Design a protein around this ligand. Structure first.
Ligand SMILES: CC(C)CCC[C@@H](C)CCC[C@@H](C)CCC[C@@H](C)CCOC[C@@H](CO)OCC[C@H](C)CCC[C@H](C)CCC[C@H](C)CCCC(C)C
Ligand SMILES: CC(C)CCC[C@@H](C)CCC[C@@H](C)CCC[C@@H](C)CCOC[C@@H](CO)OCC[C@H](C)CCC[C@H](C)CCC[C@H](C)CCCC(C)C
Ligand SMILES: CC(C)CCC[C@@H](C)CCC[C@@H](C)CCC[C@@H](C)CCOC[C@@H](CO)OCC[C@H](C)CCC[C@H](C)CCC[C@H](C)CCCC(C)C
Ligand SMILES: CC(C)CCC[C@@H](C)CCC[C@@H](C)CCC[C@@H](C)CCOC[C@@H](CO)OCC[C@H](C)CCC[C@H](C)CCC[C@H](C)CCCC(C)C
Ligand SMILES: CC(C)CCC[C@@H](C)CCC[C@@H](C)CCC[C@@H](C)CCOC[C@@H](CO)OCC[C@H](C)CCC[C@H](C)CCC[C@H](C)CCCC(C)C
Ligand SMILES: CC(C)CCC[C@@H](C)CCC[C@@H](C)CCC[C@@H](C)CCOC[C@@H](CO)OCC[C@H](C)CCC[C@H](C)CCC[C@H](C)CCCC(C)C
Ligand SMILES: CC(C)CCC[C@@H](C)CCC[C@@H](C)CCC[C@@H](C)CCOC[C@@H](CO)OCC[C@H](C)CCC[C@H](C)CCC[C@H](C)CCCC(C)C
Ligand SMILES: CC(C)CCC[C@@H](C)CCC[C@@H](C)CCC[C@@H](C)CCOC[C@@H](CO)OCC[C@H](C)CCC[C@H](C)CCC[C@H](C)CCCC(C)C
Ligand SMILES: CC(C)CCC[C@@H](C)CCC[C@@H](C)CCC[C@@H](C)CCOC[C@@H](CO)OCC[C@H](C)CCC[C@H](C)CCC[C@H](C)CCCC(C)C
Ligand SMILES: CC(C)CCC[C@@H](C)CCC[C@@H](C)CCC[C@@H](C)CCOC[C@@H](CO)OCC[C@H](C)CCC[C@H](C)CCC[C@H](C)CCCC(C)C
Ligand SMILES: CC(C)CCC[C@@H](C)CCC[C@@H](C)CCC[C@@H](C)CCOC[C@@H](CO)OCC[C@H](C)CCC[C@H](C)CCC[C@H](C)CCCC(C)C
Ligand SMILES: CC(C)CCC[C@@H](C)CCC[C@@H](C)CCC[C@@H](C)CCOC[C@@H](CO)OCC[C@H](C)CCC[C@H](C)CCC[C@H](C)CCCC(C)C
Ligand SMILES: *C/C=C(C)/C=C/C=C(C)/C=C/C1=C(C)CCCC1(C)C
Ligand SMILES: *C/C=C(C)/C=C/C=C(C)/C=C/C1=C(C)CCCC1(C)C
Ligand SMILES: *C/C=C(C)/C=C/C=C(C)/C=C/C1=C(C)CCCC1(C)C
Lengths: 228, 228, 228
């Protein structure tokens, strides 16, 4: 301790670490090349998040941003995490449905814009402008959610029932959990400052473990990850 | 205002934003997977440039570099833009001609070296050494231009007439506009300081809008982006 | 001079530069698409290392990190080099054996974790915690070495004798040289400080030139890089 939020950074570090080891063990010896893709993506996601949670816990992933007249604690390591782990999560979805390469490029690029503009917003010293970046980032998120629900209509005619079922579940998990992140950021330490950083850190920890370990448990238990 | 160059950063932000929205609308509903690739790449390019123009306009993308005895305004956000948008532009060219994967890797890697050494040159505090980085970056640019004109000779026997025609036009647009960037940098605020930053910013804005929105209008109006 | 290690940074810059030019010339005119892949990857690796050696030589790639009560010279440019060049080296191995895409993603992602946690360890101001990052990074390296020796068993039934022979040699080169890097870091300027930075710089220069130029000479002289 020293920072009240330490307990949630420690519990996030442990849960991401444990989820990593679990998926590592579970994927041992899988030979199906399609399934190997999904295990690699899905194991890397909490492994990256483990490192970035640990950097927050040890203080490396924290910086002070002046804005609003004050020195504001900003955990920038979250953006280094999400830069990699949110396109990886989208890649799992896109591979499930056999997405066209153009659609994957749109998703991963929109996601890069979402995280990079979120990071610029998190480090911006003029308070009002932080929310301009928040809005741009939210527009990119909405684009991604649009694509996830309306960009794969060529793929339904040809889509194994189990792939369609698992993709529907993971896409709903994604839309619900990812949509909460701009709200948390808006009311928390990076935005309006109406929820203290301790609670914010709690909220992102629950979202992250659910969106990474929860998501991956649903995916990796499904037969949709193997070629038929 | 406060910085004279604000007007060109604002007009660049608007033109990249407008070009983004135009390509977004134009690509709605395209189903051809090849065409979807080109729309995704070509829409992402001004979307990224919009964000980086906005960061320059709001001041986030500006830093002060000491060199030459003085505190020099350096817009570093241009390199964050180009890191992504210049390999994307090369990918559009390379996909037009069905380039081999090795050639795409050479292009994107040379381009990474060009932008990363340009960024090191832009932030280097020993004045003479800035131009060493400029020369290395220019060597990488020349390599890219060499490949664009001489690296696709296996592809001419088999190349639809419309693909060849559109590729020739976009490759000429690219060589002419991209070759102007080292010159601007050399005479401008990052180099010899013979053209003031206001005019430099103007010049890069005209080049960028032409090399991104102009380029993309030529590409996305062509039938070369659809499989035949 | 001014820093005793300058001579090894200069000799590393020259050897990476010379190796780059050699591979550039050697690959001129190769038409085989598989061979073009290997030349592009293998030429980019010392080209990137040349730029990062030069940045260390000129001082841009050096920063001072407080830890242990003192201001410690840390060459961060090594991590910017390795971020790109170590996944590229793994890609050469993986292409030799026709690795599945999931295995390539596991390798490149583990490698990203290895270099990024090595960089966090190199910049961490709390001394004991530097070694926590070192251990995590070493765990990722061990994972990569595990995959290289045990992740391609589906590929031996079908593997040209010359591909198998060249892959075995380069994999042994890789395991031996890469395993020395955590040791050097642990005893050198970033770790326990038992080997002075001058000697550390010497050691990394010999490893890097061997792991990039030595490796690439073995690869690019082999017929395993051409489709049969
Ligand atoms: C050990 C051997 O494991 C290799 C195979 C099967 O075991 O897992 C391979 C699993 C996947 C195919 C690979 C996915 C990425 C890897 C797990 C590499 C990342 C490992 C990190 C060091 C995780 C960080 C530490 C952890 C405790 C969170
Ligand atoms: C495929 C395409 C379509 C993709 C399109 C690209 C898309 C992302 C859109 C562009 C995003 C754009 C906003 C990038 C802006 C740069 C951004 C980092 C600016 C903020 O940081 C700059 C500095 C100086 O003030 O502050 C310091 C910043 C922070 C305090 C510290 C930085 C933390 C980083 C987020 C770490 C992650 C990035 C690493 C360099 C990668 C891993 C390195 C490894 C060796 C650890
Ligand atoms: C869907 C997603 C993309 C997300 C949407 C969010 C996004 C559109 C938000 C817009 C950002 C925008 C408000 C940035 C401008 C802020 C700035 C004008 C603040 C004023 O600054 C005050 C004084 C100096 O202290 O200047 C004041 C002097 C003047 C009053 C300032 C002149 C302002 C100009 C009109 C700026 C032009 C740039 C525009 C972004 C161009 C339009 C883009 C287009 C695509 C709609
Ligand atoms: C805020 C902005 C960034 C924009 C986002 C706003 C936001 C409210 C969007 C959330 C929409 C979300 C409920 C998804 C909509 C359901 C729908 C797409 C389902 C379609 O898919 C198929 C169905 C079964 O046939 O799936 C099965 C359907 C599921 C089982 C339905 C699950 C819905 C959840 C119960 C919703 C979770 C809410 C949170 C846990 C907390 C909400 C409290 C809030 C008021 C703070
Ligand atoms: C809204 C729905 O649009 C989805 C489809 C068709 O409309 O566009 C999809 C178009 C392309 C296939 C996707 C290319 C990248 C996307 C456009 C995602 C980037 C959007 C950014 C938020 C742009 C920045 C704001 C703008 C005003 C510059
Ligand atoms: C496929 C391969 C063959 C590719 C080969 C790789 C190729 C690129 C060659 C190597 C390039 C090499 C020169 C990299 C050098 C690192 C460079 C950033 C050094 C300058 O920055 C370091 C610091 C400290 O002094 O200054 C601060 C620097 C600036 C003031 C701020 C940094 C701005 C950045 C340019 C932002 C873009 C990078 C982001 C990390 C990505 C998006 C992050 C997102 C979350 C916003
Ligand atoms: C085609 C592209 C790659 C672009 C080409 C551009 C690129 C080749 C530019 C070369 C960069 C080079 C000049 C960097 C050296 C600058 C440095 C010597 C300046 C002198 O510094 C003055 C004092 C200390 O204050 O040192 C002075 C003491 C001594 C006089 C310094 C000793 C200098 C050494 C000879 C440095 C050796 C490193 C070389 C780069 C190795 C040759 C590379 C090869 C591939 C040709
Ligand atoms: C400076 C360094 C970084 C290195 C670069 C130097 C630089 C001058 C290189 C530019 C070369 C450029 C003109 C391209 C050469 C044309 C050629 C490749 C055409 C081949 O392709 C097919 C033909 C039709 O059959 O295309 C059709 C051909 C086109 C229609 C020809 C178009 C040429 C343009 C009119 C040139 C634009 C010049 C600028 C707008 C401003 C120049 C002024 C300068 C002196 C400051
Ligand atoms: C010049 C023309 O060369 C093109 C072909 C054959 O010559 O090489 C092409 C070789 C490979 C297919 C491309 C691999 C990457 C390139 C070599 C681009 C990187 C070049 C850098 C500027 C190297 C840095 C300078 C050097 C002296 C280390
Ligand atoms: C496929 C996937 C599975 C991959 C998984 C991702 C994997 C990498 C795991 C995550 C890594 C994670 C540790 C990233 C952490 C960010 C890291 C850079 C933090 C250190 O730097 C932050 C700052 C502030 O204190 O210090 C300053 C830092 C340094 C002093 C300066 C930075 C040097 C950089 C290393 C330069 C290289 C990165 C560039 C942005 C890329 C080239 C830019 C170009 C334009 C030169
Ligand atoms: C195989 C690879 C992954 C490489 C392995 C290396 C890696 C596992 C190293 C572990 C890092 C770990 C030691 C980080 C914790 C350091 C920290 C507790 C130091 C103590 O700090 C002292 C005071 C405050 O000044 O706090 C002291 C007060 C308390 C005593 C601190 C409470 C400590 C908590 C138990 C921290 C929990 C987080 C864990 C990492 C969760 C377990 C992960 C799981 C996957 C095993
Ligand atoms: C430290 C940690 C990060 C973990 C790593 C520890 C480390 C010691 C690991 C090194 C293992 C290494 C020797 C590889 C093992 C050989 C084996 C895999 C060979 C299998 O492949 C096929 C065989 C022929 O049939 O290849 C041919 C086999 C080769 C020809 C054998 C070559 C072995 C070398 C002679 C070893 C080089 C040692 C160094 C140059 C210096 C060692 C001194 C040390 C004590 C400081
Ligand atoms: C593994 C962590 C996950 C899935 C994180 C998702 C993060 C987002 C969807 C972030 C979105 C944001 C906005 C839309 C607005 C600006 C603030 C952000 C970056 C939190
Ligand atoms: C969208 C913006 C585009 C197409 C930008 C292109 C930028 C270049 C070709 C930059 C080249 C440079 C050099 C060759 C030397 C050093 C200075 C640079 C980075 C401006
Ligand atoms: C071209 C340079 C090469 C092949 C470099 C390889 C570097 C490594 C294998 C680095 C490994 C490290 C650790 C395992 C622990 C932390 C310290 C590092 C980054 C040096």
């Amino acid at each position: 301790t020293g920072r009240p939020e330490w307990i949630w950074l420690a519990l996030g570090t442990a849960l991401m670490g444990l989820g990593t080891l679990y998926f590592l063990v579970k994927g041992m010896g899988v030979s199906d090349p399609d399934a190997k893709k999904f295990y690699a993506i899905t194991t890397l996601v909490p492994a990256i998040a483990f490192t970035m949670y640990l950097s927050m816990l040890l203080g490396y992933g924290l910086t002070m941003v002046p804005f609003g007249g004050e020195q504001n604690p900003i955990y920038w390591a979250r953006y280094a995490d999400w830069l990699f782990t949110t396109p990886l999560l989208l890649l799992d979805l896109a591979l499930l449905v056999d997405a066209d390469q153009g659609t994957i490029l749109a998703l991963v690029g929109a996601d890069g814009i979402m995280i990079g503009t979120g990071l610029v917003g998190a480090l911006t010293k003029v308070y009002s402008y932080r929310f301009v970046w928040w809005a741009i980032s939210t527009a990119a998120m909405l684009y991604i959610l649009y694509v996830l629900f309306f960009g794969f209509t060529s793929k339904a005619e040809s889509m194994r029932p189990e792939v369609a079922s698992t993709f529907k579940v993971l896409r709903n998990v994604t839309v619900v959990l990812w949509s909460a992140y701009p709200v948390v950021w808006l009311i928390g330490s990076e935005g309006a400052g109406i929820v203290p950083l301790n609670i914010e850190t709690l909220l992102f920890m629950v979202l992250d473990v659910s969106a990474k370990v929860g998501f991956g448990l649903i995916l990796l238990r499904s037969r949709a990850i193997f070629g038929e």
